[PDB]
Tab-separated table of C-alpha atoms in Angstrom:
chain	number	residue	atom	x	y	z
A	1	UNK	CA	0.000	0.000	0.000
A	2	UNK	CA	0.668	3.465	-0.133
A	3	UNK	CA	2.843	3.077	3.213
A	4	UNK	CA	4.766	0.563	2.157
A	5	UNK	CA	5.909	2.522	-0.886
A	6	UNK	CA	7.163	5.334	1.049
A	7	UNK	CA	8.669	3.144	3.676
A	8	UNK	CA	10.631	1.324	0.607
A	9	UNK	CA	11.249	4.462	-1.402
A	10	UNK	CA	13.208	5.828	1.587
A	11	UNK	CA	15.141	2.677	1.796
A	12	UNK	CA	16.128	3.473	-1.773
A	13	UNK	CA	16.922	7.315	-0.636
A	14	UNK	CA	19.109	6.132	1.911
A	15	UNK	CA	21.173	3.654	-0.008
A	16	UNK	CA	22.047	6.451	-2.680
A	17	UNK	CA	22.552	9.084	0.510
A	18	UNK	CA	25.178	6.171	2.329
A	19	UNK	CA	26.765	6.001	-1.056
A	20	UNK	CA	27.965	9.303	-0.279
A	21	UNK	CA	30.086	7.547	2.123
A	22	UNK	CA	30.925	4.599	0.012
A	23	UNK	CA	29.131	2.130	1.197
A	24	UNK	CA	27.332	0.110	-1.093
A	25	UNK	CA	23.664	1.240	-1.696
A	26	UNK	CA	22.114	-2.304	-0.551
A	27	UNK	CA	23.937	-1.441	2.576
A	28	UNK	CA	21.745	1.756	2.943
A	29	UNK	CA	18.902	0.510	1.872
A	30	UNK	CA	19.008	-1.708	4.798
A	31	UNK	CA	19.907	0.910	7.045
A	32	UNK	CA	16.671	2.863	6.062
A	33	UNK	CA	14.010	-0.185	6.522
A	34	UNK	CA	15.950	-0.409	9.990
A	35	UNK	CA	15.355	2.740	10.720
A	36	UNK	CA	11.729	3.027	9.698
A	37	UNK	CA	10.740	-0.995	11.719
A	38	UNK	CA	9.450	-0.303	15.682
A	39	UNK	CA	10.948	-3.935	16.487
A	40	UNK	CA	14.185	-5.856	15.919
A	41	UNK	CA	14.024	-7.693	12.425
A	42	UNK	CA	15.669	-10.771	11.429
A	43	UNK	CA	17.765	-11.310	8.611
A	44	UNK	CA	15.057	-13.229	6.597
A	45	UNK	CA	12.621	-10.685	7.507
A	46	UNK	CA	14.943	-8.201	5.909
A	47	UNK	CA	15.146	-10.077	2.895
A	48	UNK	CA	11.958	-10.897	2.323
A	49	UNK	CA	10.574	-6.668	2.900
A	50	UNK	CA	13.415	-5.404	0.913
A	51	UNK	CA	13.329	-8.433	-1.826
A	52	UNK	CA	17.086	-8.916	-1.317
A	53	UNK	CA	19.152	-12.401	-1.035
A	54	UNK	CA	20.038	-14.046	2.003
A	55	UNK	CA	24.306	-12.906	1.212
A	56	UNK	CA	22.975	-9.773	0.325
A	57	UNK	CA	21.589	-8.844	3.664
A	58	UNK	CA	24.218	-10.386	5.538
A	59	UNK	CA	26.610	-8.781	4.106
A	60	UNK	CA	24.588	-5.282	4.757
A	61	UNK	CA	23.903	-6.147	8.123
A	62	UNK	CA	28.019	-6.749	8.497
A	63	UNK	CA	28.960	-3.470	7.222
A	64	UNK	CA	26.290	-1.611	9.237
A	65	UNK	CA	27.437	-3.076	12.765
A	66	UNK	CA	31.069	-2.172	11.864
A	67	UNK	CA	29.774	1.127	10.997
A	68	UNK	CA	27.809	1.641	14.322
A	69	UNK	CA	25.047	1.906	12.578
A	70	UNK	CA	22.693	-1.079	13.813
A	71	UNK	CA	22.973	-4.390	16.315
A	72	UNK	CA	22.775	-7.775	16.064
A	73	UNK	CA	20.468	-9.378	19.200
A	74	UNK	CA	20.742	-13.142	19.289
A	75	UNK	CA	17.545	-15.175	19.849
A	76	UNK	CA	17.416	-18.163	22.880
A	77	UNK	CA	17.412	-21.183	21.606
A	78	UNK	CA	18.278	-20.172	17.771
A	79	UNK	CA	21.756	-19.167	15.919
A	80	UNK	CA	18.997	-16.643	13.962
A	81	UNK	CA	19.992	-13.164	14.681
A	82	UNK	CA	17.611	-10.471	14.883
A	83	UNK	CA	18.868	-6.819	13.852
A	84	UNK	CA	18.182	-3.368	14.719
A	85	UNK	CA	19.266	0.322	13.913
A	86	UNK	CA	21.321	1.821	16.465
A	87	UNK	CA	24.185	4.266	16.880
A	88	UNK	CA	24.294	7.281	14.487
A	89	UNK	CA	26.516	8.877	11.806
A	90	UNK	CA	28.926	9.908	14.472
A	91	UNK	CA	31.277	7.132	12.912
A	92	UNK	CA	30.538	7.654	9.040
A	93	UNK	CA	31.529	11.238	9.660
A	94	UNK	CA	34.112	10.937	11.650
A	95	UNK	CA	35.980	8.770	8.788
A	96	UNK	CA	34.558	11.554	6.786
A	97	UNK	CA	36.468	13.914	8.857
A	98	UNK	CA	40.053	11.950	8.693
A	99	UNK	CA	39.866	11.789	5.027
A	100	UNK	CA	39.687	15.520	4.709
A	101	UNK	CA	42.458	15.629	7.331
A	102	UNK	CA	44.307	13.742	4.364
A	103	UNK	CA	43.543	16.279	1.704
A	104	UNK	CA	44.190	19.593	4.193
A	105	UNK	CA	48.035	17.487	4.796
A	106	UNK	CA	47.958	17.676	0.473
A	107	UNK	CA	47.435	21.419	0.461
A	108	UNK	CA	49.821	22.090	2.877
A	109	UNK	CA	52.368	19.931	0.970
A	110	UNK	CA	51.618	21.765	-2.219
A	111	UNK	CA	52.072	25.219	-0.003
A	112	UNK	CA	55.551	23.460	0.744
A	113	UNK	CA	56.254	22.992	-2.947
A	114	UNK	CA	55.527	26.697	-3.893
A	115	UNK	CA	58.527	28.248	-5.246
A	116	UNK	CA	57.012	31.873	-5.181
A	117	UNK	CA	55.607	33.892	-2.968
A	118	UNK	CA	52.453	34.374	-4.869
A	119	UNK	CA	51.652	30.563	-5.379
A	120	UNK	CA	52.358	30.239	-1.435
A	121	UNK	CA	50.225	32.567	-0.457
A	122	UNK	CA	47.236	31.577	-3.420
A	123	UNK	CA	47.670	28.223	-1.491
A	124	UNK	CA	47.909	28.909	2.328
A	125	UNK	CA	44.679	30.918	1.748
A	126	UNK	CA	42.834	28.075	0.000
A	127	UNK	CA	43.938	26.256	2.676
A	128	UNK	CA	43.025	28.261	5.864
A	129	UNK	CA	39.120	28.638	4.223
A	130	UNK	CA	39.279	24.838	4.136
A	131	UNK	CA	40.389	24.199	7.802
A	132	UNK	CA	37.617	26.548	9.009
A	133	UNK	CA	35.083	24.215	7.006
A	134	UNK	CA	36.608	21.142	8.241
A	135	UNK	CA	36.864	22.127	12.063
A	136	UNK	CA	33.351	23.531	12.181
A	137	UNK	CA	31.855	20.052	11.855
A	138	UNK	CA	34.600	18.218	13.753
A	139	UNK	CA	32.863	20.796	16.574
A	140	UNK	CA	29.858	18.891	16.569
A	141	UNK	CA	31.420	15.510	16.946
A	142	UNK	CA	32.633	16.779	20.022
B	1	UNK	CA	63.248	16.371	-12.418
B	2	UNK	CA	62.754	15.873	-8.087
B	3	UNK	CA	60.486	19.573	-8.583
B	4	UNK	CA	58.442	18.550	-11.288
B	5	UNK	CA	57.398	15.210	-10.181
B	6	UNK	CA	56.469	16.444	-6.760
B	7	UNK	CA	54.364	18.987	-8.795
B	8	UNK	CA	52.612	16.254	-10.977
B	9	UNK	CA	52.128	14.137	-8.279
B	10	UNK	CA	50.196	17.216	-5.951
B	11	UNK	CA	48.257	17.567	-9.417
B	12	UNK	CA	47.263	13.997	-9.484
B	13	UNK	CA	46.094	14.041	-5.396
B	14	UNK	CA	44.260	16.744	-6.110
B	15	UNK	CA	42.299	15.777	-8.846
B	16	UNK	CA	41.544	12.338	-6.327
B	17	UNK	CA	40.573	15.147	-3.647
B	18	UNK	CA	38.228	16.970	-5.804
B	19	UNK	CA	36.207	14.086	-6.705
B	20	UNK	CA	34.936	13.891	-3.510
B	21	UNK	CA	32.823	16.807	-4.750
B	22	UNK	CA	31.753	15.298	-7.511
B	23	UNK	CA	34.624	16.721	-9.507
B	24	UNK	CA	36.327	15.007	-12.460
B	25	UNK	CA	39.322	14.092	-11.758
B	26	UNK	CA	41.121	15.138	-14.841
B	27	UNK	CA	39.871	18.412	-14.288
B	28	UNK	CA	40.763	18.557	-10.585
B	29	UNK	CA	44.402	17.417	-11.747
B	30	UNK	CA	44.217	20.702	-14.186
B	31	UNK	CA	43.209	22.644	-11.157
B	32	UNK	CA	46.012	20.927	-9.037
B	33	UNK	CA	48.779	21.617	-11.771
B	34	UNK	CA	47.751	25.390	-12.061
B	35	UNK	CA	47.784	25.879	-8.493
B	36	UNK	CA	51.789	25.685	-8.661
B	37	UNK	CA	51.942	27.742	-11.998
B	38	UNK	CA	53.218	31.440	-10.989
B	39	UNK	CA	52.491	32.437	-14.181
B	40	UNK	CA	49.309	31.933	-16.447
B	41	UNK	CA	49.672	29.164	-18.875
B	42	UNK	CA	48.432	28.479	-22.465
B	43	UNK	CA	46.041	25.519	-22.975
B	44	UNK	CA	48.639	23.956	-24.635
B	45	UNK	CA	50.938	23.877	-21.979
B	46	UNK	CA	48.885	22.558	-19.726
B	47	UNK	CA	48.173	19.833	-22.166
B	48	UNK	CA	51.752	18.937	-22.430
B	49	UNK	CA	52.381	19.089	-18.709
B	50	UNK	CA	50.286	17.200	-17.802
B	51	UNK	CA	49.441	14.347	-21.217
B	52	UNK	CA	46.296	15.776	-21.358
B	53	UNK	CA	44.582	15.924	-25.314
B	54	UNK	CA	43.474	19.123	-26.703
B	55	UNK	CA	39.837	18.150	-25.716
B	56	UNK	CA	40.690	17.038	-22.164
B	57	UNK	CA	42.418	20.672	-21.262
B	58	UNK	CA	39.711	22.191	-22.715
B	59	UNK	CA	36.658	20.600	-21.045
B	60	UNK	CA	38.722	20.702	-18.016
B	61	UNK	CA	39.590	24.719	-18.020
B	62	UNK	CA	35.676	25.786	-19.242
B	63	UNK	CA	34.737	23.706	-15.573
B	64	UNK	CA	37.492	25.170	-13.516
B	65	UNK	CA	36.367	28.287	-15.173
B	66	UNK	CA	32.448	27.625	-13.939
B	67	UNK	CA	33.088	26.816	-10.658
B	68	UNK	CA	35.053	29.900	-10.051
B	69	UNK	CA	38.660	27.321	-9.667
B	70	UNK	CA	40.541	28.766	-12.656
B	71	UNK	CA	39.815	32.519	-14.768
B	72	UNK	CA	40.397	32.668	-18.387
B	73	UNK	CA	42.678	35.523	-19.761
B	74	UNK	CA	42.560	37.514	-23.409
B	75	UNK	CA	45.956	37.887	-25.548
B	76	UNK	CA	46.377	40.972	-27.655
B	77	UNK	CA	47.188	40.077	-30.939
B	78	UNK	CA	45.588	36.196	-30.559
B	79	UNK	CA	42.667	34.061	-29.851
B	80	UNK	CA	44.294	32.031	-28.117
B	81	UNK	CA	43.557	31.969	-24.131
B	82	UNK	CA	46.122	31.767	-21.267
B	83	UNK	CA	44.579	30.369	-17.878
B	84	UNK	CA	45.588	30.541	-13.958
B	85	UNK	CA	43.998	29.488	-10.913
B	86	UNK	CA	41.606	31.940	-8.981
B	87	UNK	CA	38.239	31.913	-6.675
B	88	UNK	CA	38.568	28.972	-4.613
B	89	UNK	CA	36.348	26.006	-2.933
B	90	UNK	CA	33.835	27.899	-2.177
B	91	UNK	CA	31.305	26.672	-4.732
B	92	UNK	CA	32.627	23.899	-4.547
B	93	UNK	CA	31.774	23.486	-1.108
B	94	UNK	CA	28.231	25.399	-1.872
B	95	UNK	CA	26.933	22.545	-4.051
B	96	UNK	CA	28.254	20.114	-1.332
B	97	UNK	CA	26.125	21.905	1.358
B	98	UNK	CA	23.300	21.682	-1.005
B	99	UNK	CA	23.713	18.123	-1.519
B	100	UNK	CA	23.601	17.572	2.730
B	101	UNK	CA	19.951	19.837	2.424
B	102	UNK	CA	18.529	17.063	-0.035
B	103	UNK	CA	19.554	14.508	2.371
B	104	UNK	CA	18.757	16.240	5.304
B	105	UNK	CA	15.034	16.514	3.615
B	106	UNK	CA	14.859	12.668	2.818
B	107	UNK	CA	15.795	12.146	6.646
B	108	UNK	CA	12.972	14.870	7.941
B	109	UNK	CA	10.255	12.673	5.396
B	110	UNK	CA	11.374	9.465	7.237
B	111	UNK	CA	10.564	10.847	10.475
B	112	UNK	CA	7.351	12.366	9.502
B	113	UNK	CA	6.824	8.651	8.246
B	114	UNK	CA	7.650	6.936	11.501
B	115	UNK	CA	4.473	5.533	13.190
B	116	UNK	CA	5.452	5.186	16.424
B	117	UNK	CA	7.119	7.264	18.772
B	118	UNK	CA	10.357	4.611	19.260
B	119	UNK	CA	11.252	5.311	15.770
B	120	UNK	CA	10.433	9.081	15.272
B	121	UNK	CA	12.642	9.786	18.059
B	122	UNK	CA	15.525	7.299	16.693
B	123	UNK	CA	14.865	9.558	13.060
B	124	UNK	CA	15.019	12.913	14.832
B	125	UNK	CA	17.773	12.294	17.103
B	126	UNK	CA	19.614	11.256	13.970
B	127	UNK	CA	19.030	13.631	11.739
B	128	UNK	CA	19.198	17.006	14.247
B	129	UNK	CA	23.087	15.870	14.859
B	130	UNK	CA	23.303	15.437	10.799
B	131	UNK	CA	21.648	18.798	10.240
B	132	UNK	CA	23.670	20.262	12.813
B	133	UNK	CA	26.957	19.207	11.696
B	134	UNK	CA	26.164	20.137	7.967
B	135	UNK	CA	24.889	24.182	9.404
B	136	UNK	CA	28.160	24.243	11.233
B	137	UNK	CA	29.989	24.290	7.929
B	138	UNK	CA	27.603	26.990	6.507
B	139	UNK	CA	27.795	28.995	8.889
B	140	UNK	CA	31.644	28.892	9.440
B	141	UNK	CA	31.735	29.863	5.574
B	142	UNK	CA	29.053	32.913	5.986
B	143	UNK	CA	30.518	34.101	9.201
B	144	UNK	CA	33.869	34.306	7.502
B	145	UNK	CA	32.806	36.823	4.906
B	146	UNK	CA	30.678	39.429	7.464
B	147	UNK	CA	34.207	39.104	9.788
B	148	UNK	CA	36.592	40.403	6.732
B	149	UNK	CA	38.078	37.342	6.203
């Protein structure tokens, strides 16, 4: 029903959004059915809402535990696993975060390599505006 | 020599950098490469630089040239265009922020979509730290501007 549709077309939204962060888009897509179910789910459950394969979820529900993104509840007397959405983006963007750290250590090499005074100081104010932008958000992880 | 390879190889990291903004990464090289140049530099030097084709510099300078990375210079006497680094990230870093708003909207239609409480507090939790650390960068960028920076 109409519910259902919007439920699964912001599983598709969120794949393409945690793309952004390369992870795979089925890995999103079961991040935003998690996010949208009241109770823990189970991995054929997941499957069977999202019409994915039985590698295909467990592979998505790997990558979203190591991502802090969801949790894995076992079941008594069953190896079954049910999952849930948990955590936040706190870990997504704090990866986010170090890779930029590797691009600001790039400018500042190039501001290294400047053989003019003009270049060097093109660069170290390229730079600076970048830093600002970085550190702003690396405020609200802390 | 140990100068220009360290040159060419900054070019090359910064056209992987500039792809994360959904920049080519030919064209982010281009941008990369003039970044060192002290001088402006004719399309076809920047084609031999860096073993880029006449078509590749030139697709590559007319988007530097949109997004405000690289101006475009006139030579009496010619037709021919010389080209140098200017502007900088910041529309770059516009259309990124603009990118985070789309998301942040798909997040805000997931929450109104939540049927019970359990799971419109998970969404809005979520997505007020998301929206918060995307406005932090804004902000830092328009706050930088009414200071004088």
């Amino acid at each position: 029903n109409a519910v259902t549709e919007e439920q699964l077309t912001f599983s598709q939204a969120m794949g393409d959004m945690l793309a952004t962060w390369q992870l795979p888009r089925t890995t999103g897509r079961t991040y935003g059915y998690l996010l949208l179910q009241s109770e823990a789910t189970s991995f054929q459950e997941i499957g069977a809402d999202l019409g994915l394969s039985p590698g295909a979820v467990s592979t998505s529900v790997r990558e979203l535990v190591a991502w802090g993104l969801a949790r894995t509840i076992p079941q008594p007397g069953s190896r079954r696993l049910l999952v849930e959405a948990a955590g936040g983006f706190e870990q997504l963007l704090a990866a986010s975060h170090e890779r930029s750290r590797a691009f600001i250590r790039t400018l500042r090499s190039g501001q290294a390599l400047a053989d003019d005074d003009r270049v060097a100081t093109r660069l170290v104010d390229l730079t600076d505006l970048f830093e600002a932008y970085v550190e702003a958000g690396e405020q609200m992880l802390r």
